[PDB]
Design a protein around this nucleic acid. Structure first.
Ligand SMILES: [Mg+2]
Ligand SMILES: [Mg+2]
Ligand SMILES: [Mg+2]
Ligand SMILES: [Mg+2]
Ligand SMILES: [Mg+2]
Ligand SMILES: [Mg+2]
Ligand SMILES: [Mg+2]
Ligand SMILES: [Mg+2]
Ligand SMILES: [Mg+2]
Ligand SMILES: [Mg+2]
Ligand SMILES: [Mg+2]
Ligand SMILES: [Mg+2]
Ligand SMILES: [Mg+2]
Ligand SMILES: [Mg+2]
Ligand SMILES: [Mg+2]
Ligand SMILES: [Mg+2]
Ligand SMILES: [Mg+2]
Ligand SMILES: [Zn+2]
Lengths: 82, 115, 177, 66
RNA sequence: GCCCGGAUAGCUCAGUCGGUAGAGCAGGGGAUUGAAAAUCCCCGUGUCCUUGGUUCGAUUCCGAGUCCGGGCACCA
RNA sequence: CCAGGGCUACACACGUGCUACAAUGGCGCAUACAAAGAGAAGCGACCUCGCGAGAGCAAGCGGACCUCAUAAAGUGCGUCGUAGUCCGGAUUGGAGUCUGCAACUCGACUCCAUGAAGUCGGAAUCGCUAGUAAUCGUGGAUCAGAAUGCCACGGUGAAUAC
RNA sequence: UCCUCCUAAAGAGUAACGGAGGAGCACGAAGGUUGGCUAAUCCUGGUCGGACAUCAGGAGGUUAGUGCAAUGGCAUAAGCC
């Protein structure tokens, strides 16, 4: 995975939007397209709808999801069996 | 010849015998033998009891069958409850590290089953 | 008789103090210990039950009773009179010795042992338990084992409640989670 | 108890690894060597570990620091 | 109106002394053939007509009911 | 024009190849013999650290000079002694390294464990007449990184053709 | 041809091409005696073990059982060793 010395990867367009909301308290579901960014502890308690390819799937970030990539919690291709 | 609650064969060498435990391999067996001052050409038999006692003491430094499986099960259940892609693949019974499901996925799919 | 002496010396005092008992007879006592092995595979071979009888007699020094079927059942392909289980009853010196040997040796030897449940008193103070392996008892040699066949133990006591049974077991220093 | 249907039941000594030597009546014949008795057991002593040990936050803050 | 017999895999039949239903045709990969045939290999398919009872247990034994096939309904 | 996703899905059927199913072997130590190619947004000595992928200082080389780069199979000395085996590494968990703004869906590799199915394979079918078949390694193009594929190189080296 | 209930009108008996079912056996033990014992079912707890095998208790009290069809009886047991 990512090199430990470089550190976690996060886009500014989401970092600014989450650091504003931390103090703003606007817990309305945010919207984002960057599913390649890690999850920081400050995000916990917010609802973010991430672009899976067609629409935005909402996810409520919890404590157990920190080191996991954000995109892991949004299915990309629909499948229900044959 | 009983270590960590399980029995160990006596006709095999120490390195092979220690690998019979769930969580001990060649490296973790040679390290224990080097720490306890026990050679590798000897078997489980032809040994005293203090050597086995210190072998158990050195093995206790690691994670073994009792706690090894608990940690694995807890991690799998945590992934499944979180709902990550890896947890969903584990739920569906499919490769989780990233492979092909069109062909050659028998290990996770199970035996062949036609319509 | 070591556990019997330990009981009569330092268990009745604790139980009377914690239950406000008036007489020693009110203190619960262990009536009996019965070991059961329901070998539901003796239909194919009789020796499969004759070896279970030997394995059960090697643990406690009594020849087991070969119990039979109370009635015929079709879901298990049995008829009345077929022996399908072995039973052993222990009362007195042998009961105390088996209790001591169990709690001192066999219980720690259980694989992945993390205590025992405290919700198996069936609402009457008698404690039920079951093991998934018998070789935990040191009376069995690994090189001579044929199959692995567990057993279920039941301790029948004079206690009237699960609280009293659990208190008696705690005084006897029984593994509880 | 009946005479010649029950196995021989004699006294024996079971020496434990930790040194908690005990004498019990059994039917093994020879002396016993024990690895884990009721005294040297982690659950009986009270040193039983767990699984959780915190979670994701401590690992993240100890690996990556801004 | 009366009596006898049968009801079983997608079709045609066998079987069963109470406990464990088979055969052929057919169907699904596959093999050969340029491709279909034909042939070969690998396979699996039944709640034994319905209902109520003796039984530990019924597709089997018993009593009723449905459908079908068959034999009679004569002396006036 | 841009962001994300997809081209890597999955009850399945097919072809082409890799690893194997084990003693003509696996594993440990020691020790010989090559050929042909690439290198300037590059090859990357020696030394230090990390068990290891690799990290740091930093020479040399536009190349019969230096690097890639130790050739392996092979031989000697030992162990395993025919078991799902000290064969098989699939799959899985954790901890990590490298490139790349950015390795979740999808890169490669390392370590600690986990050690499935498989014990020579049905009808049928494929390649080969000599340094060929079989087997063992090496290099290069593609490429920031990503081949068991492709293109070439050599080492051991057959049986049979009425 | 023989056995059980109803029709059979509270003694016995009492018919129909009346309504419901059985028998043409078995056992040297399934007989006699002595000694001892009481279940069907449900609930709770316990390893494989499941609605139901075996084991512990509790509720229940003949709602089981009778070698067989039915009726009348069976705890002093006619039931179970
Ligand atoms: Mg891939
Ligand atoms: Mg493609
Ligand atoms: Mg060798
Ligand atoms: Mg080093
Ligand atoms: Mg060699
Ligand atoms: Mg190997
Ligand atoms: Mg490994
Ligand atoms: Mg030619
Ligand atoms: Mg490349
Ligand atoms: Mg060659
Ligand atoms: Mg009358
Ligand atoms: Mg009258
Ligand atoms: Mg009689
Ligand atoms: Mg009597
Ligand atoms: Mg039960
Ligand atoms: Mg009757
Ligand atoms: Mg009688
Ligand atoms: Zn001890």
């Amino acid at each position: 995975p990512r090199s430990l010395k470089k550190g976690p990867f996060i886009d500014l367009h989401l970092l600014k939007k989450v650091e504003k909301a931390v103090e703003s308290g606007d817990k309305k579901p945010l919207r984002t397209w960057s599913r390649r960014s890690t999850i920081f502890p400050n995000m916990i308690g917010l609802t973010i709808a991430v672009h899976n390819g067609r629409q935005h799937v909402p996810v409520f970030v919890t404590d157990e999801m920190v080191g996991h990539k954000l995109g892991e919690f949004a299915p990309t291709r629909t499948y229900r069996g044959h | 010849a009983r270590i960590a609650g399980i029995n160990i064969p006596d006709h095999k060498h120490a390195v092979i015998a220690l690998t019979s435990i769930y969580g001990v391999g060649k490296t973790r067996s040679k390290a224990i033998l080097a720490a306890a001052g026990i050679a590798e050409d000897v078997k489980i038999s032809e040994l005293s009891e203090g050597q086995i006692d210190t072998l158990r003491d050195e093995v206790a430094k690691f994670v073994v069958e009792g706690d090894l499986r608990r940690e694995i099960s807890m991690s799998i259940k945590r992934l499944m409850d979180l709902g990550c892609y890896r947890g969903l693949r584990h739920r569906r019974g499919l490769p989780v590290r990233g492979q092909r499901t069109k062909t050659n996925a028998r290990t996770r799919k199970g035996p062949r089953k036609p319509i | 008789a070591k556990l019997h002496d330990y009981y009569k010396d330092e268990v009745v005092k604790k139980l009377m103090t914690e239950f406000n008992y008036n007489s020693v007879m009110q203190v619960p006592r262990v009536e009996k210990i019965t070991l059961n092995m329901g070998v539901g595979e003796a239909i194919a071979d009789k020796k499969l039950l004759d070896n279970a009888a030997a394995d059960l007699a090697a643990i406690s020094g009594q020849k087991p009773l070969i119990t039979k079927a109370r009635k015929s059942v079709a879901g298990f392909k049995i008829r009345q009179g077929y022996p399908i289980g072995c039973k052993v009853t222990l009362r007195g010196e042998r009961m105390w010795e088996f209790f001591e040997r169990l709690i001192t040796i066999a219980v720690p030897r259980i694989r992945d042992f993390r205590g025992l449940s405290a919700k198996s008193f069936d609402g009457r103070g008698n404690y039920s338990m079951g093991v998934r392996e018998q070789i935990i008892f040191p009376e069995i040699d690994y090189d001579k084992v044929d199959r692995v066949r567990g057993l279920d133990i039941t301790i029948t006591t004079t206690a009237k409640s699960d609280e009293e049974g659990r208190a008696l077991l705690a005084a006897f220093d029984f593994p509880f989670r | 108890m009946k005479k010649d249907i029950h196995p021989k039941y004699e006294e024996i000594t079971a020496s434990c690894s930790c040194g908690n030597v005990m004498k019990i009546r059994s039917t093994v014949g020879h002396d016993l060597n024990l690895d884990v008795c009721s005294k040297c057991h982690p659950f009986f002593t009270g040193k039983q570990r767990d699984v959780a040990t915190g979670g994701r936050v401590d690992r993240f803050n100890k690996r990556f620091n801004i």
